[PDB]
A paper describes a structure:
Sequencing revealed that this eAf1521 variant contains nine point mutations. To this end, we solved the crystal structure of eAf1521 in a complex with ADPr at 1.82 Å resolution. The overall structure of the eAf1521 macro domain was virtually identical to WT Af1521. Nevertheless, two notable features could explain the improved affinity of eAf1521 for ADP-ribosylated targets. First, the orientation of the proximal ribose moiety of eAf1521-bound ADPr was rotated such that the oxygen at the C-1″, which serves as the anchor point for the amino acid acceptor side chain, resided closer to the macro domain surface. This change was facilitated by the K35E and Y145R amino acid substitutions. The R145 side chain forms a salt bridge with the E35 carboxylate, which provides a rigid boundary for proximal ribose binding, while allowing electrostatic interaction between the Arg Nε atom and the C-4′ (ring-forming) oxygen. In the WT Af1521 structure, the proximal ribose site is delineated by the Y145 side chain, which is situated between the ribose carbon ring on one face and the I102 side chain on the other. The electrostatic interaction between R145 of eAf1521 and the bound proximal ribose also changes the rotamer of the I144 side chain. The binding of eAf1521-I144G remained similar compared to eAf1521 indicating that I144 and the formation of the tunnel did not contribute to the increased binding we observed with eAf1521. Together, these results provide strong evidence that the two mutations K35E and Y145R and, as a consequence, the generated salt bridge solely contribute to the increased binding affinity of eAf1521.
In addition, macro domains can recognize the terminal ADPr unit and bind to monomeric ADPr (MAR) and its derivatives, including ADP-ribose-1″-phosphate, O-acyl-ADP-ribose, and the terminal ADP-ribose of PAR, as well as protein-conjugated MAR or PAR (MARylated or PARylated proteins). Here, we increase the affinity of the Af1521 macro domain for ADPr by 1000-fold (KD from ~3 μM to ~3 nM) using random mutagenesis and in vitro ribosome display selection using an ADP-ribosylated histone peptide. The crystal structure of the engineered Af1521 (eAf1521) macro domain provides an explanation for the increased affinity.
Residue numbers in the entry: -1 to 192
Protein backbone atom coordinates (compact mmCIF):
# COMPACT_ATOMS: atom_id res chain seq x y z
CA UNK A 1 0.00 0.00 0.00
CA UNK A 2 3.17 2.24 0.39
CA UNK A 3 1.41 3.74 3.48
CA UNK A 4 3.15 5.02 6.63
CA UNK A 5 1.28 5.44 9.96
CA UNK A 6 2.73 8.58 11.64
CA UNK A 7 0.50 8.88 14.73
CA UNK A 8 -1.99 6.82 16.70
CA UNK A 9 -4.16 7.73 19.72
CA UNK A 10 -7.42 6.78 21.39
CA UNK A 11 -10.09 9.51 21.10
CA UNK A 12 -12.91 7.97 23.15
CA UNK A 13 -13.74 4.48 21.80
CA UNK A 14 -12.23 5.55 18.37
CA UNK A 15 -8.66 4.68 17.42
CA UNK A 16 -7.44 7.76 15.50
CA UNK A 17 -4.58 7.51 13.00
CA UNK A 18 -2.50 9.93 10.89
CA UNK A 19 -1.21 8.21 7.78
CA UNK A 20 0.96 9.23 4.82
CA UNK A 21 0.01 7.83 1.42
CA UNK A 22 -2.71 7.43 -1.22
CA UNK A 23 -6.25 7.24 0.28
CA UNK A 24 -7.33 4.73 -2.47
CA UNK A 25 -4.90 2.23 -0.83
CA UNK A 26 -6.04 2.76 2.78
CA UNK A 27 -7.60 -0.31 4.58
CA UNK A 28 -10.91 1.26 5.67
CA UNK A 29 -14.48 0.10 4.94
CA UNK A 30 -15.33 3.67 3.83
CA UNK A 31 -13.09 6.31 2.30
CA UNK A 32 -14.19 9.98 2.13
CA UNK A 33 -13.99 12.02 -1.05
CA UNK A 34 -13.23 15.80 -0.95
CA UNK A 35 -15.73 16.50 -3.68
CA UNK A 36 -17.19 19.64 -5.28
CA UNK A 37 -20.93 20.40 -4.85
CA UNK A 38 -21.87 18.71 -8.20
CA UNK A 39 -19.70 15.52 -7.66
CA UNK A 40 -17.78 16.27 -10.96
CA UNK A 41 -14.57 14.33 -10.23
CA UNK A 42 -12.26 16.16 -12.66
CA UNK A 43 -9.28 16.76 -10.34
CA UNK A 44 -7.50 16.35 -7.00
CA UNK A 45 -8.39 13.49 -4.67
CA UNK A 46 -11.89 13.28 -6.36
CA UNK A 47 -10.26 12.29 -9.70
CA UNK A 48 -7.92 9.78 -7.94
CA UNK A 49 -10.88 8.08 -6.14
CA UNK A 50 -13.13 8.14 -9.24
CA UNK A 51 -10.38 6.61 -11.48
CA UNK A 52 -9.51 3.96 -8.78
CA UNK A 53 -13.21 2.88 -8.24
CA UNK A 54 -14.56 2.81 -11.80
CA UNK A 55 -11.41 2.64 -13.94
CA UNK A 56 -12.56 5.95 -15.55
CA UNK A 57 -13.21 9.18 -13.60
CA UNK A 58 -16.07 10.35 -15.89
CA UNK A 59 -17.86 7.00 -15.38
CA UNK A 60 -17.70 7.41 -11.56
CA UNK A 61 -18.96 11.06 -11.95
CA UNK A 62 -22.11 9.64 -13.72
CA UNK A 63 -22.60 6.96 -10.96
CA UNK A 64 -22.05 9.66 -8.23
CA UNK A 65 -24.56 12.08 -9.85
CA UNK A 66 -27.19 9.32 -10.07
CA UNK A 67 -26.59 8.40 -6.38
CA UNK A 68 -26.90 12.12 -5.33
CA UNK A 69 -30.23 12.47 -7.21
CA UNK A 70 -31.67 9.27 -5.54
CA UNK A 71 -30.49 10.11 -2.04
CA UNK A 72 -31.20 13.91 -2.04
CA UNK A 73 -33.53 14.59 -5.02
CA UNK A 74 -31.10 17.36 -6.16
CA UNK A 75 -28.05 17.74 -8.50
CA UNK A 76 -25.80 19.32 -5.79
CA UNK A 77 -24.90 18.86 -2.09
CA UNK A 78 -24.32 21.45 0.68
CA UNK A 79 -21.62 21.30 3.50
CA UNK A 80 -22.47 18.44 5.88
CA UNK A 81 -24.48 16.48 3.26
CA UNK A 82 -22.96 13.11 2.30
CA UNK A 83 -23.50 11.04 -0.89
CA UNK A 84 -22.77 7.25 -0.62
CA UNK A 85 -21.52 5.34 -3.67
CA UNK A 86 -20.12 1.75 -4.01
CA UNK A 87 -16.30 1.67 -4.09
CA UNK A 88 -16.55 -0.86 -7.04
CA UNK A 89 -12.89 -1.80 -8.08
CA UNK A 90 -11.66 -0.76 -4.59
CA UNK A 91 -13.76 -3.59 -2.98
CA UNK A 92 -10.77 -5.98 -3.56
CA UNK A 93 -8.69 -3.96 -1.08
CA UNK A 94 -11.45 -3.91 1.59
CA UNK A 95 -13.01 -0.51 0.67
CA UNK A 96 -16.76 -0.88 0.30
CA UNK A 97 -18.08 2.72 0.14
CA UNK A 98 -17.11 6.17 -0.96
CA UNK A 99 -18.61 8.96 1.19
CA UNK A 100 -18.62 12.23 -0.84
CA UNK A 101 -18.38 15.44 1.23
CA UNK A 102 -17.94 19.13 0.20
CA UNK A 103 -15.81 21.61 2.12
CA UNK A 104 -15.74 25.43 1.81
CA UNK A 105 -13.69 27.57 -0.59
CA UNK A 106 -11.06 29.37 1.59
CA UNK A 107 -8.68 30.66 -1.12
CA UNK A 108 -6.07 31.36 1.58
CA UNK A 109 -8.54 32.96 4.08
CA UNK A 110 -9.91 31.67 7.46
CA UNK A 111 -12.98 32.62 9.56
CA UNK A 112 -15.58 31.20 11.96
CA UNK A 113 -18.04 30.69 9.05
CA UNK A 114 -15.41 28.89 6.87
CA UNK A 115 -14.53 26.73 9.98
CA UNK A 116 -18.26 25.81 10.55
CA UNK A 117 -18.64 24.70 6.88
CA UNK A 118 -15.46 22.57 7.10
CA UNK A 119 -16.47 21.13 10.56
CA UNK A 120 -19.80 20.01 9.00
CA UNK A 121 -17.91 18.53 5.98
CA UNK A 122 -15.87 16.36 8.43
CA UNK A 123 -18.68 15.44 10.93
CA UNK A 124 -21.26 14.58 8.21
CA UNK A 125 -19.28 11.49 6.92
CA UNK A 126 -18.63 10.30 10.52
CA UNK A 127 -22.40 10.43 11.23
CA UNK A 128 -23.26 8.79 7.87
CA UNK A 129 -20.62 5.99 8.47
CA UNK A 130 -22.21 5.51 11.99
CA UNK A 131 -25.79 5.33 10.54
CA UNK A 132 -24.56 2.58 8.08
CA UNK A 133 -22.70 0.53 10.74
CA UNK A 134 -19.31 1.23 9.05
CA UNK A 135 -16.49 0.32 11.52
CA UNK A 136 -13.58 2.14 9.83
CA UNK A 137 -13.34 5.35 7.80
CA UNK A 138 -10.46 7.21 6.11
CA UNK A 139 -10.46 10.96 5.27
CA UNK A 140 -8.33 13.19 3.01
CA UNK A 141 -7.51 16.82 4.01
CA UNK A 142 -10.92 18.22 2.81
CA UNK A 143 -10.56 21.85 1.34
CA UNK A 144 -6.71 21.83 1.70
CA UNK A 145 -6.09 21.45 -2.07
CA UNK A 146 -7.86 23.43 -4.84
CA UNK A 147 -10.26 25.00 -2.21
CA UNK A 148 -7.15 26.62 -0.58
CA UNK A 149 -7.81 26.21 3.18
CA UNK A 150 -4.65 26.39 5.31
CA UNK A 151 -3.64 22.74 5.98
CA UNK A 152 -3.00 23.37 9.70
CA UNK A 153 -6.55 24.89 10.01
CA UNK A 154 -8.05 21.88 8.09
CA UNK A 155 -6.31 19.35 10.47
CA UNK A 156 -7.36 21.36 13.64
CA UNK A 157 -11.03 21.34 12.37
CA UNK A 158 -10.89 17.57 11.50
CA UNK A 159 -9.69 16.91 15.11
CA UNK A 160 -12.65 18.95 16.55
CA UNK A 161 -15.19 16.85 14.53
CA UNK A 162 -13.52 13.54 15.63
CA UNK A 163 -13.54 14.65 19.34
CA UNK A 164 -17.22 15.75 19.18
CA UNK A 165 -18.43 12.62 17.34
CA UNK A 166 -20.54 10.12 19.28
CA UNK A 167 -21.05 6.61 17.94
CA UNK A 168 -21.13 2.89 18.71
CA UNK A 169 -20.28 1.45 15.21
CA UNK A 170 -17.28 3.61 14.05
CA UNK A 171 -14.12 2.25 15.76
CA UNK A 172 -11.29 3.46 13.51
CA UNK A 173 -10.77 6.88 11.96
CA UNK A 174 -7.78 7.85 9.80
CA UNK A 175 -6.57 11.13 8.26
CA UNK A 176 -4.60 10.26 5.09
CA UNK A 177 -2.13 12.88 3.74
CA UNK A 178 -0.57 12.28 0.28
CA UNK A 179 2.43 14.69 0.40
CA UNK A 180 5.28 13.99 2.91
CA UNK A 181 5.89 17.72 3.74
CA UNK A 182 2.10 18.13 4.30
CA UNK A 183 2.07 14.95 6.49
CA UNK A 184 4.80 16.54 8.72
CA UNK A 185 2.58 19.66 9.16
CA UNK A 186 -0.46 17.46 10.04
CA UNK A 187 1.81 15.45 12.50
CA UNK A 188 2.77 18.62 14.48
CA UNK A 189 -0.98 19.45 14.74
CA UNK A 190 -1.81 15.93 16.07
CA UNK A 191 1.08 16.16 18.63
CA UNK A 192 -0.09 19.46 20.29
CA UNK A 193 -3.82 18.61 20.05
CA UNK A 194 -3.74 15.04 21.50
N1 LIG B 1 -4.72 10.09 -3.69
C1 LIG B 1 -4.68 10.97 -2.67
N2 LIG B 1 -4.73 10.49 -1.41
C2 LIG B 1 -4.82 11.35 -0.39
N3 LIG B 1 -4.88 12.69 -0.42
C3 LIG B 1 -4.80 13.15 -1.68
C4 LIG B 1 -4.68 12.38 -2.84
N4 LIG B 1 -4.59 13.19 -3.96
C5 LIG B 1 -4.68 14.41 -3.47
N5 LIG B 1 -4.80 14.46 -2.10
C6 LIG B 1 -4.94 15.63 -1.25
O1 LIG B 1 -6.31 15.84 -0.93
C7 LIG B 1 -6.43 17.17 -0.39
C8 LIG B 1 -7.72 17.81 -0.86
O2 LIG B 1 -7.44 18.41 -2.14
P1 LIG B 1 -8.47 18.48 -3.36
O3 LIG B 1 -8.62 17.11 -3.90
O4 LIG B 1 -8.05 19.49 -4.38
O5 LIG B 1 -9.80 18.87 -2.58
P2 LIG B 1 -10.58 20.18 -2.11
O6 LIG B 1 -11.53 19.89 -1.01
O7 LIG B 1 -9.52 21.30 -1.86
O8 LIG B 1 -11.42 20.52 -3.45
C9 LIG B 1 -12.54 19.67 -3.80
C10 LIG B 1 -12.93 19.90 -5.24
O9 LIG B 1 -13.50 21.22 -5.38
C11 LIG B 1 -12.72 21.96 -6.31
O10 LIG B 1 -13.51 22.87 -7.02
C12 LIG B 1 -12.15 20.91 -7.25
O11 LIG B 1 -13.13 20.47 -8.18
C13 LIG B 1 -11.79 19.80 -6.26
O12 LIG B 1 -11.72 18.52 -6.87
C14 LIG B 1 -5.15 17.93 -0.80
O13 LIG B 1 -4.36 18.17 0.36
C15 LIG B 1 -4.48 16.97 -1.81
O14 LIG B 1 -3.07 17.07 -1.86
Amino acid sequence: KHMEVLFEAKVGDITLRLAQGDITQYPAKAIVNAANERLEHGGGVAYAIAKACAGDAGLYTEISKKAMREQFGRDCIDHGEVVVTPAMNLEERGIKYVLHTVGPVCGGMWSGELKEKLYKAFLGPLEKAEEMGVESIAFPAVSAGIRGCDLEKVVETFLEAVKDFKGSAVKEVALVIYDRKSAEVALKVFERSL
